[PDB]
Curated annotation (Swiss-Prot):
Domain notes: The first bromo domain specifically recognizes histone H4 acetylated at 'Lys-12' (H4K12ac). It also specifically binds histone H4 acetyl-methylated at 'Lys-5' and 'Lys-12' (H4K5acme and H4K12acme, respectively). The second bromo domain recognizes and binds histone H4 acetylated at 'Lys-5' and 'Lys-12' (H4K5ac and H4K12ac, respectively).
Residues of the whole record sequence present: 344 to 455 of 801
Subunit structure: Homodimer. Interacts with E2F1. Interacts with (acetylated) STAT3; promoting STAT3 recruitment to chromatin. Interacts with CTCF; promoting BRD2 recruitment to chromatin.
Lineage per the UniProt record: Eukaryota, Metazoa, Chordata, Craniata, Vertebrata
Gene that specifies this protein: BRD2
Family: Belongs to the BET family.
Location of this chain's protein in the cell: Nucleus; Chromosome
Bromo domain: residues covered: 2-111
Name recorded for this polypeptide: Bromodomain-containing protein 2
Length: 113
């Protein structure tokens, strides 16, 4: 009912959309933590100090970790920023990040007041 609750509902809706089949073609690299060892990315954790992914965001939302929309958005944007920091800008995963961030930013902007 309250403002914080209402804004977190909007955030949860966005999260559900980002994890939905509608966006799966470009969202899937963000579903789980980057497994650096599995992907042969042995410099990943030297470059990315604070990894983030949608499963972690989901766990935090479920645990009521996020106190407001701003805190939620910071994690989603951290996830994208990590991608832009680590990967050359012409790489496929970056194109996918850009597309998912477009989904995120446009819906996040429709936050209720
Ligand atoms: C460096 C990096 C790898 C992945 C990743 N996760 C899976 Cl599972 C496969 N990959 C590699 C990939 C290669 C080509 C296209 C998409 C992902 C995801 N993110 C966000 C990254 O920053």
């Amino acid at each position: 009912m309250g403002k914080l609750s209402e804004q977190l509902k909007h955030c949860n809706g966005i999260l559900k959309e980002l994890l939905s089949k509608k966006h799966a073609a470009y969202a899937w690299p963000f579903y789980k933590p980057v497994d650096a060892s599995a992907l042969g990315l042995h410099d990943y954790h030297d470059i990315i100090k604070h990894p983030m992914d949608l499963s972690t965001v989901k766990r935090k939302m479920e645990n009521r970790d996020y106190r407001d929309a701003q805190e939620f958005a910071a994690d989603v944007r951290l996830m994208f920023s990590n991608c832009y920091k680590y990967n050359p800008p012409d790489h496929d995963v970056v194109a996918m990040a850009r597309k998912l961030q477009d989904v995120f930013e446009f819906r996040y902007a429709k936050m209720p007041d």
